[PDB]
Design a protein around this ligand. Sequence first.
Ligand code: 6IC
Ligand code: GCP
Ligand code: MG
Length: 169
Amino acid sequence: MTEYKLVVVGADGVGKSALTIQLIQNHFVDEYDPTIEDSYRKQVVIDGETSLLDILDTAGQEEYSAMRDQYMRTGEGFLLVFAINNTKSFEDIHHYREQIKRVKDSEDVPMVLVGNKSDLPSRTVDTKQAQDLARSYGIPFIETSAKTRQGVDDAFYTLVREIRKHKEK
Ligand SMILES: C#Cc1c(F)ccc2cc(O)cc(-c3ncc4c(N5C[C@H]6CC[C@@H](C5)N6)nc(OC[C@@]56CCCN5C[C@H](F)C6)nc4c3F)c12
Ligand SMILES: Nc1nc2c(ncn2[C@@H]2O[C@H](COP(=O)(O)OP(=O)(O)CP(=O)(O)O)[C@@H](O)[C@H]2O)c(=O)[nH]1
Ligand SMILES: [Mg+2]
C-alpha cells in the first residue's frame, strides 16, 4: 500500500494538533497538550488511490540537532500552518520554509500554506496577503478551521497531490 510522509509545521498555538486530530478522528476539542510531538496515521482514498498518511504533528522546543534534521528530511510534504488571527505566526512561515529547503536540499519541496482558525472574527492576516505569499512560493493556499472542519481534508489531500506532482518529475 502507498504511503505518504506528511509533516505539519508552524508557530505555537496555530492549530497543528487540532488539524491532525480532525483528519484522523473527525472531531475538535477545546484543549490539546501543547507539548506532544508524535506521528499518527490515517488510511484514506484520494482520487481513487488508497494510501496511508503518516502525519508528524510537530511541537516542543526550538532546537536544531542533527537528529532532528534527519527526521525532518524524511518528510515528503509539509503543511505550513499559520493562524489568521496571529500575524507573527504568518511572519514565521518564511523561517519554516527555509528550514525545510535546508534539510531537503531542494528548492522544490511539496508544501501547502494553511491559514487556520478561519472561523474566528478577529482576523489580522488578509486572505490576499496569504494568497500572494503562496503564489510567490509556487504552492497552494488553503483556508481551514479545525473547529468546524472547513478545509481540513482539502489541505491534507492537496498536499498529497503536490507530492504526486513532485514524484512525476
Ligand atoms: C518546525 C520545523 C523544522 C522544519 F520544518 C524543517 C526542518 C527542521 C530542522 C530542524 O533541526 C528543526 C526544525 C524546527 N523545530 C522546532 C522549531 C520551533 N519550535 C518552537 C515552538 C514553535 C513550534 C514548535 C517547535 N514549538 N520553532 C521554530 O521557530 C520559532 C521562531 C520563533 C522564535 C525564533 N524562531 C525562529 C523564527 F523566528 C520562528 N522553528 C523550529 C524548527 F525550525 C525544523
Ligand atoms: N477557533 C479555533 N480554535 C482553534 C482552531 N485550531 C485550534 N484551535 C484552538 O487553538 C489552540 C491551539 O490548538 P492546538 O491544536 O493545540 O495548536 P498547536 O499548533 O498544536 C499548539 P503546539 O505548537 O504547542 O503544539 C487551542 O485552544 C485549540 O482548540 C481553529 O481552527 N479554530
Ligand atoms: Mg500541538
